[PDB]
């Protein structure tokens, strides 16, 4: 896998060049944003169970076809598997936020996931709706101004929204 540094390292080794001034300056800016990135990872991790439970509540409230007898998320076994799937997707989104590159999210969670959900009969649009709800919950929790020092965090929120849209698009 790669993080925000080793992705640029792998690109430079493919090109066979040393890093220029612009790439090192971009990586230094990423290091400057790194504390905000770790704050985002900490907040989503600390409210992960709340995010998964509230997203499951809203998903099966707006889509009651899944929890009804016969629905995929019906039966405590399949429901526990669905809650595990929300927890796994949120966990790998936090992993991709931590690395700063989505290599862990593509290569470790989203690869074969669409074919998994097609072979299982899992409706991937419902999973994408749950990922959208985890996105809005996590972006509200990151952007909470209380209990943390002031600063601009539009870049990391945009990156987390990109990771969440990547997770939702891989199952849709």
């Amino acid at each position: 896998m790669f993080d925000v540094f080793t992705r640029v390292v792998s690109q430079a080794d493919a090109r066979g060049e040393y890093l220029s001034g612009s790439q090192l300056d971009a990586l230094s800016a990423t290091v400057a944003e790194g504390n905000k990135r770790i704050d985002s990872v900490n907040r989503i991790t600390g409210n992960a169970s709340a995010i998964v439970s509230n997203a499951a509540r809203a998903l099966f409230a707006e889509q009651p076809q899944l929890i009804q007898p016969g629905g995929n998320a019906y039966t405590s076994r399949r429901m526990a598997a669905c809650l595990r799937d929300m927890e796994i997707i949120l966990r790998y989104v936090t992993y991709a936020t931590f690395t700063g590159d989505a290599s862990v999210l593509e290569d470790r969670c989203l690869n074969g996931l669409r074919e998994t959900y097609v072979a299982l009969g899992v409706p991937g649009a419902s999973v994408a709706a749950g990922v959208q709800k985890m996105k809005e919950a996590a972006l509200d929790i990151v952007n909470d101004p209380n209990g943390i020092t002031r600063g601009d965090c539009s870049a990391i929120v945009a990156e987390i929204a990109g990771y969440f849209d990547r997770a939702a698009a891989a199952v849709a």
Binding site: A81, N111, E115, A119
Partner: protein
């Protein structure tokens, strides 16, 4: 790591088709040589699906297709013949 296990429905078999299995620091651990990297077909039950996916993913393999079988038998694998 799943609730599927200890269940009859968790004996539902699937076939994973994985590509790109190559040596890597993640693969440097292995004590045996890998002989094929083209298209490896692995039969996996439902209970064991989480373990197989992580294992395939940990080694860097890319999953291309997962075919359901609608059976507990691995008979429609038909790849090594």
């Amino acid at each position: 790591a799943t609730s599927s296990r200890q269940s009859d429905a968790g004996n539902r078999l699937f076939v994973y088709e994985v590509i790109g299995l190559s040596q890597s620091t993640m693969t440097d651990g292995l004590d045996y040589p890998i002989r094929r990297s083209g298209s490896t077909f692995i039969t996996v039950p439902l209970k064991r699906m989480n373990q197989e996916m992580r294992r395939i993913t940990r080694m860097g393999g890319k999953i291309v297709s997962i075919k359901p079988l609608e059976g507990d038998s691995p008979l429609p694998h038909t790849e090594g013949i």
